[PDB]
Amino acid sequence: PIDHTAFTSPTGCPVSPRAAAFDPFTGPYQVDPAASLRWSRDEEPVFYSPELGYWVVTRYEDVKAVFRGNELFSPSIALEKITPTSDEANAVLARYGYAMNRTLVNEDEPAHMPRRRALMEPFTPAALAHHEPMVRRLTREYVDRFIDTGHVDLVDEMLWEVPLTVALHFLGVPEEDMDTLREYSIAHTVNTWGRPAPEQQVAVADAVGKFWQFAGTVLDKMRKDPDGHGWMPFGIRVQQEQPDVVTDSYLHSMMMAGIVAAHETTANASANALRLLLEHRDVWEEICADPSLIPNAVEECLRHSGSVAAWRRLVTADTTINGVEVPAGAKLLIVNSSANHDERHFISLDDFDIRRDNASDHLTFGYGSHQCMGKNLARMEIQIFLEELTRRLPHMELVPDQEFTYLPNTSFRGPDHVWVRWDPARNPERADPELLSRRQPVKIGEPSKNTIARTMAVSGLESIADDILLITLRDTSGRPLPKWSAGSHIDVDCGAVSRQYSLCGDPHDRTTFQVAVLHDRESRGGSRWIHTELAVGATLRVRGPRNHFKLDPDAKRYVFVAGGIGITPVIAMADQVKAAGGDYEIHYAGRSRTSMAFLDRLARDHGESVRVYPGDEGVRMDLPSLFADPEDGTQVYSCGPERLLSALSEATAHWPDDTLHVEHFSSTLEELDPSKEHGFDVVLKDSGITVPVAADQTVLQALRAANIDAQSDCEEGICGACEVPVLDGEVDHRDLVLTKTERAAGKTMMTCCSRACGDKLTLQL
Ligand code: HEM
Ligand SMILES: Cc1cc2nc3c(=O)[nH]c(=O)nc-3n(C[C@H](O)[C@H](O)[C@H](O)COP(=O)(O)O)c2cc1C
Ligand code: FES
Incomplete structure (x- = not known):
């Protein structure tokens, strides 16, 4: 028979050599889990493992599919300990009378979702904005202790500690009470996801029991100051609002559940990213140039080297997963690390590419019903860790010939140590001391597609009208800029805000973009900033051309009407049509001829075809006459203040439907009501x-x-x-x-x- 030859799955099917040779506790999966299951992504995406007790799921579509089907794949076993707790260690737990409820990570439905939705708000990026000064304080309080040594283990002295403290601050625990809760805070990776010795099991049960009853007093102390900052005080108010949803047992569980979900996963992520970056030092130095790419950088690290090598689900009914039959009761090992490295969803995946427009899709935070609530807390935390260390110590490098040891377990991955050298005298910090007052605002919660951007440099500012600059924007990379058609704009960060401005430069010049910003007399801040505090040599983040003002090039004729600064997109459309060799008519009005940009430009070219109507002299554009009655082929694109766009839309109502095209520089809405x-x-x-x-x-x-x-x-x-x-x-x-x-x-x-x-x-x- 076949059972004389190979191992058999619980379904009676034979087990492959590579599947039966799978071990998550030693060898190839501890060195690099993703690479260790390349063979599974290619030829066997789902297999039974004899060494461990689970079925292994390897490809990204599949483990995402397991996360979404939360009725078929239960998180019941999410923190089930690989080897069971001994009678000794349970006795130690019972001595502190510890009884923790399943808290959001283990909870099945229907209990999980109401508690998640109720407790969600403090995790949102809007709620996390309060905590951003606290983590910046704590991130620096640590780095300046070892700043002058030129030599440090980042893990033990910086990255193991900081995520623990901010978790305590996120939870709302008094600073008086924090230092012991940390003393009772320990590693759980080997004891939950590994093969611990009986002595290890008890030492955890002792530290966890100590922490359970001390956190019991802490909850009673803050029980009567509910209206203060923190997740736990927020949890107290929902108890009075929904007493059955949120129980005294639950927030007592929420105390430990909170900072075990937050400490090691963030520390390991920090350590991974710093090791991953200092390995490719060119991309390290890129972050040192401008910190604008830190947000997506930490996302590519989380995809490439996350804190979660794999996660677990409990199959609740007989299913098939990618052709392999999986029975009810089967336990799933869904390898997030392999998923993040599946060729079917990402491209050139084992490459470390921080501008990757795809990083945000990694499953390091999970997916669906139970997706990590503190993902943006961890995203913020990493981003600031990685801005201070790139700000102050860009001359830091890894101690060479260094071996990195990672604890044997199924799910958590982070180095015991990362050893870094640097030249202390050479810190840019001691000659500045200006770089520290520099703080870059966190950017979290946004997909990687929406945060990719080129940081260009301003090579020139020219005044071409009153209250109107012409900005010349240069790409510092040196590598050519996209092609753009007429009407295209860009999104440029004007200080703390982003605005869009059409491109009035030359398209055939593809080392630059040109925009002509107007000083809005009533300015919410974006237009002022450009006029008031931008100089030559600055650099602006600018997100590639889009276009909602495209022209149909097969139209018979184009007549362009333009008011004020609406001249910028139309003049590029006028240029396309002169290139084509097509009849066009352009009508340009404005409050004053002095404040009407590009008349010079409009005189040297299209001068045979332009007519000007400056208001100050008193010659006005009466649209009723111009569009008195239509012609079949004529189209009209137009751009300016809403009053002319509106009035024009009235004058052109007589025409065929797709005749008029407009681009708004302001918005109408809104009133919500x-x-x-x-x-x-x-x-x-x-x-x-x-x-x-x-x-x-x-x-x-x-x-x-x-x-x-x-x-x-x-x-x-x-x-x-x-x-x-x-x-x-x-x-x-x-x-x-x-x-x-x-x-x-x-x-x-x-x-x-x-x-x-x-x-x-x-x-x-
Ligand atoms: C980069 C560091 C972190 C990683 C890699 C990570 C990963 C995860 C994963 C994989 C899950 C389970 C997903 C699922 O089952 O869908 C999870 C659930 C959770 N995480 Fe994290 N996490 C990190 C930091 C945090 C932090 C800082 C907090 C804040 C205390 C946090 C709070 C949670 C909570 C409350 C859940 C359960 C939510 C639910 O099941 O509805 N996590 N996390
Ligand atoms: C040359 C120029 C082009 C503009 N192009 C666009 C555009 O293509 N799309 C858009 O929504 N707004 C456009 N705007 C409007 C700006 O985004 C913004 O609302 C305006 O300059 C004032 O900013 P502020 O009110 O914050 O000071 C443009 C403004 C100027 C001066
Ligand atoms: S945010 Fe710009 S359109 Fe919705």
């Missing part, structure tokens, strides 16, 4: 959850309330950064970016202002 608006449900098919949107609530607000990744720049319906695909349902379109045909197809929606017409929509999210 739920009274006129109805709530609905939005379900996220990829994630496998339904988020409710209230009448007073935008779709965008509900997504960030579930801490789903989203980027929003304008939220006035004008910029386009919040677009997301619609699989089902018809949408109440309220943006100004999508063409009336794009709104018809219903394939897409703007997260911040558009809604449902109706009861539900399905989004690819």
